[PDB]
Enzyme design. Sequence first.
Site, PDB file in Angstrom:
ATOM      1  N   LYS A  54       0.796  -1.211   0.000  1.00  0.00           N
ATOM      2  CA  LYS A  54       0.000   0.000   0.000  1.00  0.00           C
ATOM      3  C   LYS A  54       0.827   1.257   0.000  1.00  0.00           C
ATOM      4  CE  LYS A  54      -3.998   2.054   0.178  1.00  0.00           C
ATOM      5  NZ  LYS A  54      -3.696   3.349   0.841  1.00  0.00           N
ATOM      6  N   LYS A  66      -5.953  -7.711  -2.416  1.00  0.00           N
ATOM      7  CA  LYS A  66      -5.601  -8.847  -3.252  1.00  0.00           C
ATOM      8  C   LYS A  66      -4.194  -9.371  -2.847  1.00  0.00           C
ATOM      9  CE  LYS A  66      -8.385  -7.682  -7.374  1.00  0.00           C
ATOM     10  NZ  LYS A  66      -9.466  -6.764  -6.984  1.00  0.00           N
ATOM     11  N   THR A  95      -6.724 -11.777 -28.430  1.00  0.00           N
ATOM     12  CA  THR A  95      -6.073 -10.479 -28.498  1.00  0.00           C
ATOM     13  C   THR A  95      -4.556 -10.595 -28.742  1.00  0.00           C
ATOM     14  OG1 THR A  95      -5.706 -10.135 -26.131  1.00  0.00           O
ATOM     15  CG2 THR A  95      -7.837  -9.389 -27.006  1.00  0.00           C
ATOM     16  N   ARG A 177      19.254   1.411 -27.715  1.00  0.00           N
ATOM     17  CA  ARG A 177      19.715   1.492 -26.318  1.00  0.00           C
ATOM     18  C   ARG A 177      20.655   0.315 -26.056  1.00  0.00           C
ATOM     19  NH1 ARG A 177      14.099   1.509 -25.442  1.00  0.00           N
ATOM     20  NH2 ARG A 177      14.449  -0.193 -23.939  1.00  0.00           N
ATOM     21  N   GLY A 183      11.912  -6.691 -29.614  1.00  0.00           N
ATOM     22  CA  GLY A 183      10.623  -7.241 -30.083  1.00  0.00           C
ATOM     23  C   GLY A 183      10.252  -6.870 -31.519  1.00  0.00           C
ATOM     24  N   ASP A 186      12.252  -0.464 -35.596  1.00  0.00           N
ATOM     25  CA  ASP A 186      11.631   0.805 -35.770  1.00  0.00           C
ATOM     26  C   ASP A 186      12.621   1.759 -36.459  1.00  0.00           C
ATOM     27  OD1 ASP A 186       9.927   2.948 -35.467  1.00  0.00           O
ATOM     28  OD2 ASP A 186       9.512   2.523 -33.363  1.00  0.00           O
ATOM     29  N   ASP A 247       8.618  -1.272 -38.503  1.00  0.00           N
ATOM     30  CA  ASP A 247       7.925   0.017 -38.760  1.00  0.00           C
ATOM     31  C   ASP A 247       8.922   0.986 -39.353  1.00  0.00           C
ATOM     32  OD1 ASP A 247       5.587  -0.997 -37.630  1.00  0.00           O
ATOM     33  OD2 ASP A 247       5.690   0.250 -35.805  1.00  0.00           O
TER      34      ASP A 247
HETATM   35 MG   LIG Z   1       9.620   0.030 -31.202  1.00  0.00          MG
HETATM   36 NA    NA Z   2      -3.968  -8.091 -30.671  1.00  0.00          NA
HETATM   37 NA    NA Z   3       0.007   3.698  -2.230  1.00  0.00          NA
END
Ligand SMILES: [Mg+2]
Ligand code: NA
Ligand code: NA
Length: 326
Positions: A54, A66, A95, A177, A183, A186, A247
């Site tokens: 917390k 939780k 997804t 970097r 992944g 670019d 990309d």
């Molecule tokens: Mg990227």
């Molecule tokens: Na997706």
């Molecule tokens: Na907090």
Amino acid sequence: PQETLNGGITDMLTELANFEKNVSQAIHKYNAYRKAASVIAKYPHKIKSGAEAKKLPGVGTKIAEKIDEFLATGKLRKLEKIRQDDTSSSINFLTRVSGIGPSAARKFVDEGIKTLEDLRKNEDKLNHHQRIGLKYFGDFEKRIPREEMLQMQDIVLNEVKKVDSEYIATVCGSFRRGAESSGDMDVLLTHPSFTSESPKLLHQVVEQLQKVHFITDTLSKGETKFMGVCQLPSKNDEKEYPHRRIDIRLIPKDQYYCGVLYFTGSDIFNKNMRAHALEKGFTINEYTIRPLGVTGVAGEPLPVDSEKDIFDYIQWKYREPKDRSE
DNA sequence: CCGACGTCGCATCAGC
DNA sequence: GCTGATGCGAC
DNA sequence: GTCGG
Ligand SMILES: [Mg+2]
Ligand code: NA
Ligand code: NA
Ligand SMILES: [Mg+2]
């Protein structure tokens, strides 16, 4: 910090982020769960209770709770139940196909389509992007070791220079970097003939890269942004390399270095750099750095000729890309 | 109590 | 036909 | 869900 400290907590939190995003369609809860997963991942002590969690910024009352449940039982009931829910775990799974978001995943599961098998039997119900996503499902989740990135970068710079030696290209991302793997790729592009106080510059490049068989498919293409697939050529009798997301963006000359900085990241570092930027009377997005006014008045974009210039305005020693993790 | 939580290019949908 | 809104992916 | 005006 070793993932075995609070690993069970951060995986729980990220799993809950996923359901918010993909199933509940509650992007703000998804980002709240991820923000709390992050601050936990970085915390250098074994969490002993929710009240302890917390204290961290982004951990509120319900996550505290939780955490307590997870600590006492080694699980969460709500998470256990969502997992065995056919409708919800299907929606969540689909997804993972690039191009199927929460909303297309819902639509598919509504009408019986739950698995890649189902997606395969139903090509006609997928858009172009979604077919490409389906076709490369496996490939798209793999990582790219640096060695293949350097090889991909060789092709890109060679072909860009061949199209027109006045282009400037910089592969950004975690590649830039110095990361051990990435992944995707670019590429940011500019050209002396292109400023903003001013549609083939992009297409020509994309075209050359398909011509030497480096770009294999297209997800989207417009005048300034291309999203696609590429693949290194295969070694002489060797097994073929996986297909990769690439990309390529075309940016006007006077916005190039803001763009380079922004797509160099990491987002964490950009969050910082933005915050410090604000602290000294400046705002920085992907396009520009602008001075803030006597009232919050972001004014004219300032002259920028390199990454350094930016760092200069906000008074920071230029940070080497290798140090931009935070 | 309640609004913010980054923003944006492109593909495609909804509606005229 | 066109315009605007929505979905998506993504520092 | 969490933070803060
Ligand atoms: Mg990227
Ligand atoms: Na997706
Ligand atoms: Na907090
Ligand atoms: Mg020349």
